[PDB]
Amino acid sequence: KVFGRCELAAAMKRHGLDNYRGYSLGNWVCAAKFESNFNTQATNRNTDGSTDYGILQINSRWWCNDGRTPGSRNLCNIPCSALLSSDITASVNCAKKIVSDGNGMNAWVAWRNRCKGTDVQAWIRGCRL
Ligand SMILES: [Au+]
Ligand SMILES: [Au+]
Ligand SMILES: [Au+]
């Protein structure tokens, strides 16, 4: 599914991401925009042979099992395909574990390079939240 901006803002807020570990909702919408273009079906191969999955591009190297990242972790205890659903629950509850692990939103390269330090409130402008 490809979310509308305000549609994803609404879902992320409902799932308890607004201000999660002090990251405003705008940070999460900005990350999702630049990670996946709001597309739950997004998959991208990493150089080490891991793959990033779903609307928040969660990495098989640490967080999920995709059956082809040998010697990796599965710290969210899910198949990476669960991260590709039209329903963002699994991506949200895994992202909460990632952002809590000491590195904050710096784990998301697109957030670091395109959202961090910017006016991220612009990403929720116009939305009825
Ligand atoms: Au959730
Ligand atoms: Au994020
Ligand atoms: Au949802």
The DSSP code sequence of 50-111 is -EEETTTTEETTTT-B-SS-TT---TT-SBGGGGGSSSTHHHHHHHHHHHTTTTGGGG-HHH
Ligand 2 centroid from CA 71, angstroms: 25
CA 7 – CA 109 distance, rounded (Å)? 23
Q: Which ligand is nearest to the CA of 11?
A: 3
Q: Which ligand is nearest to the CA of 106?
A: 2
State this model's resolution in angstroms. 1.8
Q: Is the dihedral of CA 11, 125, 21, 112 positive or negative?
A: positive
Ligand 2 centroid from CA 56, angstroms: 7
Q: Is the dihedral of CA 60, 65, 71, 74 positive or negative?
A: positive
CA 18 – CA 11 distance, rounded (Å)? 10
- All domains in the chain, ordered by first residue: 1-129 (1.10.530.10)
3 state DSSP class of 118: coil
124 in Cβ contact with 115 (< 8 Å):
no
Ligand 1 centroid from CA 71, angstroms: 28
CA 14 – CA 101 distance, rounded (Å)? 22
User: How many DSSP H helices and E strands does the chain contain?
Assistant: 4, 3
